[PDB]
Each structure stands twice: as C-alpha cells, then as structure tokens.
Paper text:
PARG, a single gene alternatively spliced to generate five isoforms, is an endo- and exo-glycohydrolase that rapidly degrades PAR generated by PARP1 to coordinate DNA repair. PARG hydrolyzes α(1′′-2′) O-glycosidic linkages in PAR chains to release ADP-ribose and oligo(ADP-ribose) chains that may signal genotoxic stress. The hPARG active site has two deep pockets that specifically engage the adenine and diphosphate group of ADPR. Our high-resolution crystal structures of human PARG bound to these methylxanthine inhibitors revealed detailed interactions that support a mechanism of competitive inhibition.
The crystal structure of JA2-4 bound to hPARG refined at 1.7 Å resolution, identified a single JA2-4 molecule in the adenine-binding pocket. JA2-4 makes extensive site-specific interactions with hPARG, consistent with its potent inhibitory activity (IC50 of 0.9 μM). The methylxanthine head of JA2-4 makes π-stacking interactions with Phe902 side chain. The tail of JA2-4 extends from the 8´-position of the xanthine ring and is highly curved, which serves to make van der Waals contacts with Asn869. Structural superposition of hPARG bound to JA2-4 and ADP-HPD revealed that the methylxanthine core of JA2-4 occupies the same binding site as the adenine of ADP-HPD, consistent with a competitive block of substrate binding activity. Additionally, the 2´-carbonyl oxygen of JA2-4 hydrogen bonded with the main chain amide of Ile726. The most striking feature of the JA2-4 interaction with hPARG is a significant change in the Tyr clasp conformation. The JA2-4 binding site is obstructed by the side chain of Tyr795 in the unbound hPARG and in hPARG bound to ADP-HPD. To accommodate JA2-4, the Tyr795 side chain is flipped out from the adenine-binding pocket (with ~90° rotation), which positions the thioether of JA2-4 in contact with Cβ of Tyr795. Most notably, JA2-4 binding caused the Arg671 side chain to swing ~9 Å towards the tip of the Tyr clasp, where it makes an electrostatic interaction with Glu797 side chain and hydrogen bonds to the main chain carbonyl of Ala750 (not shown in this view).
Numbering used by the authors: 450 to 523, 531 to 648, 653 to 963
C-alpha cells in the first residue's frame, strides 16, 4: 500500500513560505546584475543595464559573438556581420539551416554532421510542423539571436574555478544567448576553454540518433514559447567554493527529518525545495550532445539551465553551482532510450522579490566508481560528503529558512554509486547543513523501505553525524579494506545495525 515513509512531505519546508526577506537586488563585486533593478517590476520585461552594448574580449568574460573582436579571414572581416548575412535567409529545407550555420563555422564544414537535425525536420516532424518550424520558429529564433547586442549589453564574467560569485540576468537575456548557442555562434568554443562545457549546439545536430530528435522537440517547445512572448523573470547563477569542511568524525549534530518515497520526481514533487541535479563536473553533462539521463533531462525541461555552460568552469571537488529562478517549459516521459517530449508545461511557481521563479537547483557531481568498493575508501566517502555539503550549505541563513533537500539516487547509475551508501552520505551532509531530506527512490520500493528503516533506527538511538561517520569508517576497516572480492562479505546497512545493536 504505502507509497512513502517517514516525515510527511507536507511538513517539510519549501519556498517561498520558508524564505528569507531578500535584500535589495544590487550589483556588487561578487554579484553581477545585468538588468535595471530600479525598473524591475512584476510581469514586466526587465530592461538591460547598461543601455548601450559594452564589450569585453578577454579570459575572464564570455566572448560574445557580436564583439567587434570576433573576426574572420577575408584581411579581417566582422564575423558578427557574417552571422547576420548567413542567418537572414529563408529556410525551407534542413540543408538551408546547415548551410547558414557553416558560413561562419567554415573550419567545421567537413567535421559537423547534421544528420540528426535533418532526420528531425524530415523524418520525425509532421509536414505542417516542419512548415511552422521554418516559417515562424526558426526566423523568430534568428531575430532574438541577432538582437543580442541590445539585450545582453553587459559583459558576463566567467564563473571560474575557486570563484564565489553570482550572475543575475533576465530570462529574456538567456533566451537570446541560447538562440545564439542553437545557431552555434559562440566564438572560440569549438576548438581542439578545455575546462568549460560545450555551449554551441552543433553536437545536437550530429550523428544517427533517436534521442536527439526528442531533445530538439524539447528545445523547440522552449524556443517557440520565449519567441512568442518575452519571459519576464530573472535567474541567478551562483558558484559556491568552500574552503573549510566539517570534521565529520567529530560532528555532534543530530540527524534531520526524512521523507522517502518510490513515487514522484524531484522536479514535480519537490516544488520549492532544494532540487539536486546529479551533475557532471562539466555542468549539464551531455545535454548539448548524446546524454539523456537525470541532469540532461532537467536541463532540457528547464533550458535556462543550459546557459550555465556558457560561463561555468568545470567544478572542482569543493565546488557547486546553484541556480535560482529557472522555468519549466516542457513535460516528458521516460529517460535515455525511452525519453520522449510530452507537451508544453505552464509553470505555476510563484516568483520571489527578485522576480525569480521559486525553483532552486544545485549541480553537485558525484564521483564515477569504476570499481565498486572504491567508494567505501574513507577519502572517497569524505569527498562525496563534502561535495553534497557544499551543495546544501547556505552560509548566513537560519535553518528555519532553509527548504528541504529534494534528491534521489545521486551517482548510482553509470557512475557506479551504491544507493544505500549514497543515501546515508546525503543524509549526513544535509544534517550538517541543517536541512531536512526528501528522497525519491525512482520506483525502488525496497530501497525506500531500507533508507527509512536505517534513518529511523539511527535517529531513535540519537546517533550524531559523527557517530554515523565512524560506523562508515568501521565498515570500511572491517569489511572492505582487506576484502579480496568485488563485493564485501556483509552489506553496509546490516553491518550498521549489528554494530549499533552489539554496543
Ligand atoms: C529521483 N530521481 C531519479 S534517481 C532520476 N533518475 C532519472 S534518469 C536515470 C538516471 N539514473 C541515475 C541513478 C539511477 C537512475 N531521472 C530521475 N528523476 C527525475 C528523479 O527524480
């Protein structure tokens, strides 16, 4: 019968009800703000700040396609002029789009295949859908792309490694930038930035692929929406890089509350909660290429997430990316080979006092364990604890103003994570950051039961974060360290129950 266990989800904190009164939005040395704060009003398109386009072409900012410094060989010509000439043409067939994009990407004319775009347009779309694509949607996307200088007037700093910095920009600004990414206009981003994710969409168009046409349905749902009517809100992207981490073994904090369920999703059932993105260290993973599991799906249904790839350097072990305000534009079914775009989604989230949707997503990247027992090594357990802790902690916020963490089987698919260990690691990290946990087991009812049982066992016995961490070290030292097979003799949760009940 029972679809969920533990603390009722109704009793967990959510935004906006739990939220702090926000400070006045203003640019600072650690907060870039690309809109006119004095004119920010509910339901109105934000006005760019400054009024006139200002350019930076350097290693600390986005290199904009509209920069006068974006050149091509003719003598040098303006590549932005070339982009305008190429894209201001009628498309009636997919080859026309391919030919346009290659005009200003000539070096890639033999490297970039457009089979997946062709298949989408010719072999997936209905003829009327393809007509609407080339008569309306693509031209509207070109226009928002080419409007970039008037939209994104303020240089966008890179969120580089070790930076603790925030960018608050409009949904409209993101739309223009993403349209540029679709048309593969971002310079210097294709090459042999090896520490930044891909931003141009060329790999969405390549190869023989069934996933890619569904990815394109999802993205075109977004582009149809934001070109039909400008979006009015803001989004904040924050890189957080922590210098000091808990002494896990000495941590005297109690565990927090747990809701665990095998039904539901992070994105639908964790509304208003801190929603985990099971991230790649290159945020967004393979969203611009072949990937289509939890991170890439979130980045497709909330495409404003994708623009993080324009400016977010590969995450180090002590870092995360927190994104507040992205909008959900699509609904879907399935994942990977079964992923399908379903329909457009009208996001009903309330907005906060900075006109951000009350949706907060944190990109935290688990480790990939090629050997299963490697993850029980103390250094590896501590790495995961500290990553999750970085993702959950909000310095200078009372615990009563923190939403619950909405998560699931972080790093337990392709990355080889043990779901039971990962659950306890996230429970410990949440406890240390003084947040409750809402855990979605994605159809695994036995895992739901197991996590519930262990959590209530540890809490009833009033074990601290440190107490639990020491039991993990015990498990490593007694069952794993000197273990001579791919799996240990005794499983982790049974081991913990015995160790505590024997004491
Ligand atoms: C809780 N949760 C889960 S675990 C998840 N997995 C996916 S896609 C396949 C990825 N695999 C990674 C680890 C095992 C599954 N999408 C999901 N969503 C929306 C979700 O709420």
């Amino acid at each position: 019968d029972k679809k969920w266990l533990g603390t009722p989800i109704e009793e967990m904190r959510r935004m906006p009800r739990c939220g702090i009164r926000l400070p006045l939005l203003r640019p600072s040395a650690n907060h870039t703000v690309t809109i006119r704060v004095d004119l920010l009003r509910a339901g109105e398109v934000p006005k760019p700040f400054p009024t006139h386009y200002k350019d930076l072409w350097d290693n600390k900012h986005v290199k904009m396609p509209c920069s006068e410094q974006n050149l091509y060989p003719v003598t040098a010509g303006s590549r932005w002029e070339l982009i305008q000439t190429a894209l201001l043409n009628k498309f009636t067939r997919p080859q026309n789009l391919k030919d346009a994009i290659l005009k200003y990407n000539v070096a890639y004319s033999k490297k970039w295949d457009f089979t997946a775009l062709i298949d989408f347009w010719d072999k997936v779309l209905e003829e009327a859908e393809a007509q609407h694509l080339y008569q309306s949607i693509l031209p509207d996307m070109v226009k928002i792309a080419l409007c970039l200088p008037n939209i994104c007037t303020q240089p966008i700093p890179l969120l580089a490694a070790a930076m603790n910095h925030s960018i608050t920009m409009s949904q409209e600004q993101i739309a223009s930038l993403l349209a540029n990414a679709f048309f593969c206009t971002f310079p210097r981003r294709n090459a042999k930035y090896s520490s930044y994710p891909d931003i141009n969409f060329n790999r969405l168009f390549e190869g023989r692929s069934s996933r890619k046409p569904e990815k394109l349905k999802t993205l075109f749902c977004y582009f149809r929406r934001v070109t039909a009517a400008a979006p009015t809100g803001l989004v904040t992207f924050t890189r957080q890089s922590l210098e000091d981490f808990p002494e896990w073994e000495r941590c005297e904090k109690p565990l927090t509350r747990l809701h665990v369920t095998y039904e539901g999703t992070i994105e639908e059932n964790g509304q208003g909660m801190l929603q985990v993105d099971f991230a790649n260290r290159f945020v967004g993973g393979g969203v611009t290429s072949a990937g289509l599991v939890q991170e890439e799906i979130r980045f497709l249904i909330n495409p404003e997430l994708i623009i993080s790839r324009l400016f977010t350097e590969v995450l180090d072990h002590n870092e995360c990316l927190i994104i507040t305000g992205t909008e959900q534009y699509s609904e879907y079914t399935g994942y990977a080979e079964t992923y399908r775009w379903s329909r457009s989604h009208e996001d009903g989230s309330e907005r906060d006092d900075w006109q951000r949707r009350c949706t907060e997503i944190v990109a935290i990247d688990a480790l990939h364990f090629r050997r299963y027992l490697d993850q029980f090594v103390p250094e590896k357990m501590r790495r995961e604890l500290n990553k999750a802790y970085c993702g959950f902690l909000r310095p200078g916020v009372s615990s009563e103003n923190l939403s619950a963490v909405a998560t699931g089987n972080w790093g337990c698919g392709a990355f080889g994570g043990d779901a039971r260990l990962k659950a306890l690691i996230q429970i410990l990290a949440a406890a240390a950051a003084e947040r409750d946990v809402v855990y979605f087991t994605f159809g695994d009812s036995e895992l739901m039961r197991d996590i519930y049982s262990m959590h209530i066992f540890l809490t009833e016995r009033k074990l601290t974060v440190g107490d639990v961490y020491k039991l993990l070290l015990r498990y490593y030292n007694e069952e794993c360290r000197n273990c001579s097979t791919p799996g240990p003799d005794i499983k982790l949760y049974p081991f913990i129950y015995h160790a505590v009940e024997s004491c």
